[PDB]
Amino acid sequence: TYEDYLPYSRTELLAKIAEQMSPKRFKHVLGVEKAALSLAECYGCNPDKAGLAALLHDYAKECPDQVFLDLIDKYQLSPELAKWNNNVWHGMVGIYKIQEDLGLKDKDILRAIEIHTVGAAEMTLLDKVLYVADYIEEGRIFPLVDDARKIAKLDLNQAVAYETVNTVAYLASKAQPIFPQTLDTYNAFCSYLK
Amino acid sequence: MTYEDYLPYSRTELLAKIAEQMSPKRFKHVLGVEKAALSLAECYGCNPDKAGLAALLHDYAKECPDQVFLDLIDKYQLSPELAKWNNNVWHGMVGIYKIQEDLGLKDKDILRAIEIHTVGAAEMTLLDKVLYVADYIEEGRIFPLVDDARKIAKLDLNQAVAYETVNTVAYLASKAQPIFPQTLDTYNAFCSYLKEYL
Ligand SMILES: Nc1ncnc2c1ncn2[C@@H]1O[C@H](COP(=O)(O)OP(=O)(O)O)[C@@H](O)[C@H]1O
Ligand SMILES: Nc1ncnc2c1ncn2[C@@H]1O[C@H](COP(=O)(O)OP(=O)(O)O)[C@@H](O)[C@H]1O
Numbered sequence A: 001t002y003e004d005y006l007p008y009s010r011t012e013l014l015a016k017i018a019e020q021m022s023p024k025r026f027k028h029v030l031g032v033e034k035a036a037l038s039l040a041e042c043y044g045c046n047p048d049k050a051g052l053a054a055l056l057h058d059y060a061k062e063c064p065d066q067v068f069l070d071l072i073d074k075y076q077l078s079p080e081l082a083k084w085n086n087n088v089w090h091g092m093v094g095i096y097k098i099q100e101d102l103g104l105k106d107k108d109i110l111r112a113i114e115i116h117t118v119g120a121a122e123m124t125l126l127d128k129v130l131y132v133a134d135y136i137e138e139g140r141i142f143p144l145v146d147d148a149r150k151i152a153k154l155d156l157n158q159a160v161a162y163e164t165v166n167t168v169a170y171l172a173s174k175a176q177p178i179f180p181q182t183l184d185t186y187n188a189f190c191s192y193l194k
Numbered sequence B: 001m002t003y004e005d006y007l008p009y010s011r012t013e014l015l016a017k018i019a020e021q022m023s024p025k026r027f028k029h030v031l032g033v034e035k036a037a038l039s040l041a042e043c044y045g046c047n048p049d050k051a052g053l054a055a056l057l058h059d060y061a062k063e064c065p066d067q068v069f070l071d072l073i074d075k076y077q078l079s080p081e082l083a084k085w086n087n088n089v090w091h092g093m094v095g096i097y098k099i100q101e102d103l104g105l106k107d108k109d110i111l112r113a114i115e116i117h118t119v120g121a122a123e124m125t126l127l128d129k130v131l132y133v134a135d136y137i138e139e140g141r142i143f144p145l146v147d148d149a150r151k152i153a154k155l156d157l158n159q160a161v162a163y164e165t166v167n168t169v170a171y172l173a174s175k176a177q178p179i180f181p182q183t184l185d186t187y188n189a190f191c192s193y194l195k196e197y198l
């Protein structure tokens, strides 16, 4: 339960989150919540924080590009962010929409949501829990997910490495631009996958 | 074609000096890069004397031990972040100072092409791009991606640079090897030419 961080009960918070997104997307979010709570109890991070980070991580996934461009300007974010896309924005910039809409103040939860797509070179246990739960949640079936599910309850750092390497390989396979912080993560975790 | 405007060597004197730096297999790779760079230069209009010499010298420091590059980094007070990397990054990015000390090369354009022949840059001249693709598509290189790279290189040089940089990043990912940040600079600057290709 999440009342230490937000003035919402569960039924109201899930209703508010559900107002932001498609049913396929909201079902993904509940899967990430289940996956993050089970990773939190395995690795010992606070499940109240893990579960809430999971419920909110894709809160801004469906906002149009202008919402993120306006937040970049309003909160004086690095102007270089404006050259990117929703993949980068919905976490890195969407945390400002989460704070405005919901009043979330917890730095640890906000940071985990902020980097849940691109990672960082230095990630806390909470950051890694969400980063892996988002990938391995039960509704995601893609062939590369299944080894990540196995790695994740043995060694969390190797689960992060596996995701970041497969992401850089996927982006390269489509010739899509790789955000520089995604490289920070890749180089920081490359050795755990070796 | 001949390079005495830039170095105090004739061809036989220069090729003897280069062959002293490296294995015979590596020297055969270098002669091939010279052939491909000359064949890229008259087509796209860069100076073949500048292109051929950059190709002859690009792997001059390939076989130097790590301490040669660490000593050069300190001596020329290059970025300390370079010391965390490896020969793959150093032999062009730092090896240009060994070329300058050993051979007296001062041509800024040739030196810059050698400097980034492995990792690229976000901004590349025509000469830089010629060397970068010539090194990849050279006649002795046989790996599965060579043939499409050779095909692209005669239509669109920017799409050939894009093809090499994007495929280099995918290879490094397949081995979990660390990617130098300037390689990403190249990748992100050229990724759009490979989308249009694809
Ligand atoms: N560093 C990066 N640069 C560009 N695109 C990226 C980068 N990292 C991840 N992506 C892409 O972002 C997309 C969204 O990812 P993510 O937030 O992890 O999950 P979801 O869509 O569940 O929100 C994926 O399609 C992924 O390939
Ligand atoms: N960013 C990078 N990080 C680590 N290795 C790299 C990077 N970019 C290229 N390499 C590697 O450097 C090696 C030597 O490359 P290169 O200099 O282009 O060949 P040559 O040595 O014939 O001129 C290749 O194995 C390539 O995969």
Ligand SMILES: [Mg+2]
Pocket: A057, A058, A061, A090, A091, A116, A117
């Ligand atoms: Mg997301």
Ligand SMILES: [Mg+2]
Pocket: A028, A032, A057, A058, A134
């Ligand atoms: Mg998600």
Ligand SMILES: [Mg+2]
Pocket: B058, B059, B062, B091, B092, B117, B118
């Ligand atoms: Mg080389």
Ligand SMILES: [Mg+2]
Pocket: B029, B033, B058, B059, B135
């Ligand atoms: Mg070479």
